[PDB]
């Protein structure tokens, strides 16, 4: 079958010489059966114990019948012939014989015949697998049929599991071992013996087989007309030996100082440029020695197919056949900016027929090992947002022009620095970045993010990474930066008055920054409308008067901090228009506050706060206001006053009754009231246009309470 | 085994001469096994060692048994016959045995014989290819299977070209074959025919044995002579034979060079070029098989060919696509025209010629395409996108061309990809580029044949330019639109372009001019200007547009104008003006002087107030202030009534002033951004506004009357 391949030359040069012995073994034994024989005379004068050899001249006659011949011959045929002459073709056939079974038991051994049939066919399908040709190839990837790609996965799993199976055996070498060093031995022993005894085949025999009584003579001299044939036979069956001896050093020595245990691949990686070839154990190298003795190209596609680059080219196009465009435009999905968006989790690579979704607006990476984004990508021309979370992606040249001038947003969480590439300062158009993980580390801080500067159109820069200072390169990049956005996560973010020099900074939030104060920095942001210090651990913000540097100060927070008192100097901050200063420990409200008159939205959630000035009123262009889980009892009728108030949220309170002047706020479309110790409802709170039942926050029970009108005036305004 | 192709005709001849050899020499080997004997009778009268042999006749006794006879027989067959004569039978054996494995060695070599199966194997499917026969046949449906097939085999003959050229070792095996069968030949011919005179009937042995025997000589006649001696007579002839046979096939060996094959005839007759000669261990393997059969040569020879490959592919890719798939393809573009677009694919597939309602054709990464004269099978087409796509055309497809484009783009990644031939259009009047082609020592030279558009009248040069090319400027002589964008590189003009009075409208986009020069004022007839993305803060230079007697549209958006100049007022033949994106914060009056103005796009200002003056343009349709801080609209907004869409998104407006719906022409309205209060009640009496042009939320949707609420979805619906 295949097992042609697994014989050396040396092997089918020691099979035919086995074959060429055996043959002439074969015809030695048929003649000397069947035609040889011993031509005995007798001796009438014996000299020493021998033959003494000492009108027309006449026959000598020795008075014996013919029957007497054949007795003498056959008895000095028996005693008086050399062993070694006599049983010359059976001792060549023995030797040939076993010569054969020494070059076939592992062959016939069952505990190595499977492994044997087992890898010749594996190398085979191997060899003969259309993906190593296509890898090489390459020496951009095309397709794989999907049912190829399924048969060539099949054969990687076989390819592993074999080799794991096969390398830890180590029967199959030890058993060759044993035959080539047997099949030395042997050919020494039988070219020494032989030699040895070579010169015994004689033409001419002297016998004194000591028979008188039945003949009457004592010494005899025989022909054996075979002599000279058995020699020449035997002349040319030791050099035939003597060839099979060369054959047997010539395979130990290649297998004693190769040491074949290990096969390193050296060449092939250094010519295809396939690092990824792991090298081969014992009972599986040697094994690969054979067939690089046959054939060093089965190794080399056999080693192809077990490069593990080999590996990744295949699974993703496996992945590329399993992926469809259709499914793709179905999943897409509309992002927190209701963008079309599809967050890509959990996913090894990506599929090439997703880059067809020239639709594409915002994208979500995570989980991505490294993925190579071909230009491909470049069909998505909408895609001017992305989320990298996790994933060291790599993209191309082309691919990077396109998204240099295709994205405006950036959305960066990455565990380590390489998970950034190196080439995304060339895309300057990004104007919005939302960085994540740690890059304050030690003796190399902010050292890669020095190309932030070369964002120049950089506007947006959100950062969370634990920072404790505010770098150099940040803030120079800060000066054009419109919004910048620091997420300390806990960590106390310092600025050593450098937060100043980004003077054009429009908007600023600073969030979980431990900051527990403004400094004058801060206050010397003018351009600083909307700010937030959320779980800054803020304990006393009465500096808050300098924001009167902000002229145009709109959105103020200092919510989730110690705050437990508002400045009345946030009087002379009239600039307010928005304020979020909940999950503080505030317990009451001063009439300073109440002098922002641009004020619209509001949050003062989760505090000690106790009661509602009068001047709550002059607030009016409040529409939107949470004050949950505070000890609020009663509703002042100046709360009632702010009629464009639209939302609310009054969770969580001490409150016992409800006002009927609600009904007076006509603007109102939603209000939370549950969490309160309420009882019965006033009418008038179902008579506001804009709130619903919906909109009405409130526990079911108090709702039975109102008039069934009331539910079913509600319940119609729901409807349409 | 389907190595009896691999044998030629002298192979087959020397293994039926080896067949018979080997045959006789059993024949002579058994016999003489069997039979060979020698029957002597010695002689009484001896003279000189020599048998002198010098009432009816009398039998000679001897005085000798039976075993004396035997045992002298035997003795002078050992002693006095010649080796030669006895062992001529296993000599043969020999001979033949060393014909037969010189023969065979190279086919059970291994490394020859792998290379041997490869190439046999190779060459057999080679001929059973289902293309194989079409190529010879054209010297038609090709199914996608076949076609993939025939791919792979071309993969394989690479493959194995690229392996076995290499290899110059069969070639030298059976060199060293053929010499070792004819010296052999040679020396079994001379010491045969030498000692062949030995083989007598009948010898004389002088064995010398008198104290067993009592004789001197003894003749022995040997009866099987004669039957040797045809034996080795009809051998000799044999050998001869074969002889002869090797000698040729050395000579012809010798002859012709097999290591390399011209591989000519083919390459002439099926006019396919691309058959190169194959290297050594090659051109032996095609040798044999033209000695065969060369039509396995020649099926080989074709997917050999290069040309071959291409048609395959070709073939493939046009069965791959059908007419049904690209109409179902055939889309709309902006230009309002029936556009079919195609991104990366290998060739043209030549069903797309039954198209012809298609108008604008769109090709990218479309490698190594020529335009067939089936395209003036489609005469609908006439814009052509040129993305990347290397194209070379036939002269019947540019012909039809000259005569049926209108407007070309060409998106180009190098010079190279813009095919020369371009220039010779005669129709061509709208043109758009894409791609850098600015050079050192020689800058814009590819661009020389731009003159050769006579019709050439509306152009676009997105080229990266750094500075305004001369031929562009002489070939501006005729033009009337020029479109510039140098993708935020600084444009040099420097006084070339003023030429171009022919001009309408122009355009300069991200030209980086931070102020306008001085020769854009010499067009007079320039009716619409834009400048986007160019760094202008001070536009004073609109004082000399008073030239311009049509000055109609102008654009100065995504610029860093800090200011209005009041000159702008005596620009009163402005009608529609975008100046977004700038860092204006003021309006002042004069330019409401300019009545004619239509539209008007101010977003992304530092703008604060809405002088009254606004009302002065009554001409005003459209308007966008979208991300300003305009706190309130005066009424004066409201005197315009032809107003039909107004964007006053992210702005700071707290309330819509009544008069909303005085304005009956508006269309439109953005109030999302604003920060708003309630909708006015007047909202309900607006006659042609619906909710699709009402951008606002829901949440201040529900402030309008129930009446407001139907009569909006009633619009809304239909």
Redesign the interface.
Request: with cysteine; proline share 9%; net charge positive.
């Given at each position: 079958p295949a097992y042609?391949?697994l014989?050396?030359?040396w092997d089918?040069f020691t099979d035919?010489i086995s074959i060429?012995m055996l043959m002439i073994a074969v015809f030695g034994g048929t003649?000397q059966v069947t035609?040889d024989k011993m031509?005995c005379?007798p001796?009438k004068?014996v000299t020493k114990d021998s033959?003494?050899?000492?009108t027309?001249?006449?026959?000598?006659?020795?008075d014996?019948d013919?029957h007497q011949?054949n007795y003498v011959d056959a008895v000095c045929y028996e005693n008086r012939l050399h062993w070694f002459a006599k049983y010359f073709p059976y001792l060549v056939l023995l030797h040939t014989l076993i010569f054969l079974a020494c070059s076939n038991f592992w062959f016939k051994f069952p505990r190595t015949s499977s492994k044997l049939e087992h890898f010749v066919s594996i190398l085979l399908k191997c060899f003969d697998s259309?993906w190593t040709?296509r890898a090489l190839?390459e020496t951009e990837t095309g397709v794989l049929d999907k049912k190829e790609g399924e048969q060539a996965k099949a054969l990687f799993e076989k390819v592993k599991k074999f080799r794991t199976h096969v390398e830890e055996g180590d029967i199959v070498y030890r058993l060759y071992m044993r035959q080539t060093i047997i099949k030395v031995i042997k050919f020494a022993l039988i070219i020494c013996y032989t030699v040895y005894y070579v010169h015994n085949i004689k033409?001419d025999v002297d016998c004194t087989v000591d028979i008188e009584s039945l003949t009457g003579y004592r010494t005899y001299?025989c022909?054996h007309?075979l002599a000279?044939l058995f020699k020449?036979l035997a002349s040319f069956y030791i050099s035939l030996v003597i060839f099979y001896g060369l054959i047997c050093m010539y395979t130990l020595w290649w297998m004693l100082r190769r040491s074949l245990k290990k096969y390193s691949f050296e060449s092939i990686r250094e010519e295809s440029s396939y690092s990824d070839i792991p090298d081969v154990k014992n009972d599986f190298a040697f094994m690969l020695h054979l067939i690089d003795q046959?054939?060093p190209?089965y190794s080399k596609r056999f080693a192809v197919f077990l490069s593990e680059v080999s590996e990744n080219k295949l699974r993703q196009l496996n992945l590329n056949n399993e992926w469809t465009l259709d499914k793709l435009r179905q999943r897409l999905t509309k992002n927190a900016q209701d963008k079309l968006e599809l967050h890509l989790f959990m996913l090894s690579g990506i599929p090439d027929t997703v880059f067809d979704l020239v639709e594409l607006e915002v994208l979500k990476l995570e989980l991505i090992p490294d993925v190579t984004i071909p230009p491909?990508i470049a069909?998505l021309t909408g895609l001017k947002e992305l989320w990298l979370y996790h994933t060291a992606a790599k993209i191309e040249a082309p691919a990077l022009a396109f998204l240099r001038e295709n994205l405006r947003a950036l959305h960066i969480k990455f565990t380590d620095i390489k998970e950034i590439p190196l080439w995304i300062y060339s895309l300057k158009t990004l104007e919005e970045l939302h960085l994540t993980g740690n890059l304050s580390a030690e003796n190399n801080r902010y050292i890669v993010i020095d190309g932030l500067r070369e964002l120049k159109r950089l506007k947006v820069l959100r950062l969370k990474s634990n920072l404790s200072k505010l770098p150099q390169v940040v803030t120079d990049v800060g000066v054009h930066l419109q919004k910048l956005s620091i997420n300390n996560e806990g960590t106390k973010l310092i600025v050593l008055n450098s937060l100043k020099k980004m003077v054009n900074l429009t908007e600023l939030e600073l969030i979980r920054c431990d900051l527990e104060r403004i400094p004058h920095s801060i206050f010397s942001l003018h351009n600083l409308q909307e700010i937030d210090l959320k779980d800054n651990n803020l304990k006393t913000i009465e500096e808050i008067i300098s924001f009167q540097h902000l002229h145009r100060l709109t959105c103020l927070k200092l919510w989730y901090n110690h705050i437990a008192y508002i400045p009345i100097q946030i009087g002379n901050l009239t600039n307010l228009?928005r304020l979020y200063l909940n999950r503080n420990k505030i317990e009451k409200i001063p009439t300073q506050l109440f002098y922002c008159r641009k004020l619209?939205y509001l949050d003062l959630s989760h505090n000690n706060l106790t009661f509602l000035p009068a001047d709550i009123g002059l607030l009016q262009?409040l529409?939107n206001l949470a004050v949950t889980a505070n000890r609020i009892e009663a509703l002042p009728p100046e709360l009632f006053q702010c009629r464009?108030l639209?939302a609310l949220h009054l969770g969580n309170n001490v409150l016992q009754s409800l006002p009927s002047r609600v009904g007076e706020l006509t603007?109102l479309?939603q209000i939370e009231l549950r969490g309160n110790r309420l009882e019965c409802l006033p009418v008038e709170l179902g008579e506001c246009?804009?709130l619903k039942r919906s909109g009405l926050v409130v526990e079911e029970d108090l709702f039975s309470t109102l008039p069934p009108e009331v539910k079913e005036r509600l319940w119609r305004a729901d409807k349409?």
């Open positions: 042609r391949i014989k050396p030359w089918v035919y060429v003649l035609q031509i005379l001796c004068w033959c003494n050899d000492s027309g001249p006449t026959g000598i006659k020795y014996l013919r011949y259309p040709t190839s033409f001299r022909a007309p000279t020449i046959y054939d190209l491909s069909q228009e619209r262009n529409q464009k639209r603007n479309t246009p804009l349409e």
